[PDB]
């Protein structure tokens, strides 16, 4: 039972709307706990989960200061990337950053992540050894050489293996009642005739946490990835998630199909059949 | 808890 902490930063130049927009959200596993928005009135890092509201005023002031410093460097980095790619001050552009760490069930470091994107595509990423960088194109190669000269990898790894893990443990403790939960999915099946010789079987999973889940359709034991439609796992909005998987089947063949549900909250995988 | 801003200029 491993856990995660992650920060997701979005910084958007707005040519025609003044200053850029700076947004950041933090997660433990699939639960959000903080947010920042430079368009909001407070200009402050703000709580978004009940177990983080215990944190005192110096924690919020310290996080706000690191957000402000991050936003200024994203502000300068937008301009640098405009020059690298020969773009215009009239163009809107996006920098995205994800970083964080995973701990095991004992609470100790297991892996760290740091990855930057420009306009929706990989720009530069820290490799798994937290000592090495992957540059996605020639522009990112300039950044990579800069970051090798200024010990960027070590600076990230000290946080990923240190502060990151220690904060994750604190939050896992302080929000133990909710963050350690495992809600198995409640499952069911609908049936919808397409023609008078075809029908849609839909396999539903509801109210599960965490978000990761597998839904597969088998036909007489056969993996059936033929016309198997699958939607994006979605939030219920109450802390749980939903998904469904559908397959079109020949009318009267309904009982040859099975739906299999794999979730961390399930002792054994569930098999479902329209009958 | 956030990482400290630093050594991340492109």
């Amino acid at each position, epitope marked *: 039972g491993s856990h995660s902490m992650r920060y997701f930063f979005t910084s958007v130049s707005r040519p025609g709307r003044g200053e850029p927009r700076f947004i950041a959200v933090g997660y433990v596993d699939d639960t959000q706990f903080v947010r920042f928005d430079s368009d909001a009135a407070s200009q402050k890092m703000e709580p978004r989960a009940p177990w983080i509201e215990q944190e005192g005023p110096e924690y919020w002031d310290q996080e706000t200061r690191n957000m402000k410093a991050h936003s200024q460097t994203d502000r300068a980095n937008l301009g640098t990337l405009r020059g690298y790619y020969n773009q215009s001050e009239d163009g809107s552009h996006t920098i995205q950053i994800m970083y964080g760490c995973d701990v095991g069930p004992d609470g100790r470091f297991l892996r760290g992540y740091r990855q930057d994107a420009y306009d929706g595509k990989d720009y530069i990423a820290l490799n798994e050894d937290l000592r090495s960088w992957t540059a996605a194109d020639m522009a990112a190669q300039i950044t990579k050489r800069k970051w090798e000269a200024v010990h960027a990898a070590e600076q990230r790894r000290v946080y990923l293996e240190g502060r990151c893990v220690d904060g994750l443990r604190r939050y896992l403790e302080n929000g133990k009642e909710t963050l350690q939960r495992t809600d198995p999915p409640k499952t069911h099946m609908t049936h919808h005739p397409i023609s008078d010789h075809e029908a849609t079987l839909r396999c539903w999973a509801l109210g599960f946490y965490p978000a990761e889940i597998t839904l597969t359709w088998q036909r007489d034991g056969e993996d059936q990835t033929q016309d198997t439609e699958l939607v994006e796992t979605r939030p219920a909005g109450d802390g749980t998630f939903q998904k469904w998987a559908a397959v079109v089947v020949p009318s009267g063949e309904e009982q040859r199909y099975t739906c299999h549900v794999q979730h961390e909250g399930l002792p054994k995988p569930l098999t479902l059949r329209w009958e | 808890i956030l990482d400290t801003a630093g*050594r991340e200029e492109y």
Partner: T-cell receptor
Amino acid sequence: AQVTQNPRYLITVTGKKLTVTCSQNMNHEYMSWYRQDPGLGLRQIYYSMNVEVTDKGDVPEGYKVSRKEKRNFPLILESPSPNQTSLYFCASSLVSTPLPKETQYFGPGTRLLVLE
Amino acid sequence: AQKVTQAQSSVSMPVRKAVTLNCLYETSWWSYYIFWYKQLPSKEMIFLIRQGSDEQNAKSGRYSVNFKKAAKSVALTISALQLEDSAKYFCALGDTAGKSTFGDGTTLTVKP
């Protein structure tokens, strides 16, 4: 590799604007000003985490700073008063949370005396 | 509160021996650093060693820190004292975003 403060010594009269400069040519992101009264420790005035980032310390009143470029971090006293008589230190480091074997550098000090 | 206390104002110890300079702190910060500084009679300020709140006991040359997190005590130990170790030593607390709080110092006299 050094932090420079100018002036190292200054005697000035109450209310006459002054600036104490601090510079380093090591491309350090982090710079910070403190004052040390006799027998006490260093009280943080303002600090700057990088170009165009400043934040108040414990005793910012009567002081301003700016950080237009990495190299300079001036301390501005709009209207010096006698209780700003103190020993002022500028400090810098490559990043605001140095790595294990990384140093915080200090300037030599500025002895400021404000008199009627 | 946010306070760093060095309770001994002066300590004197013979050359070639070891000295321990105590430091207690109160803080609501739960992620932080402790710094040790040396101030010469010339008032030159010199950084000595840094102790991370999640790290093992810091050690560098003749300096070492005995970090007791639950007690909020990070004493500095100087080994094999030399006459040049006579200074005023300062203990300080720093957060993850540039802020710092100093103690008021301990004066160390190394007696020949």
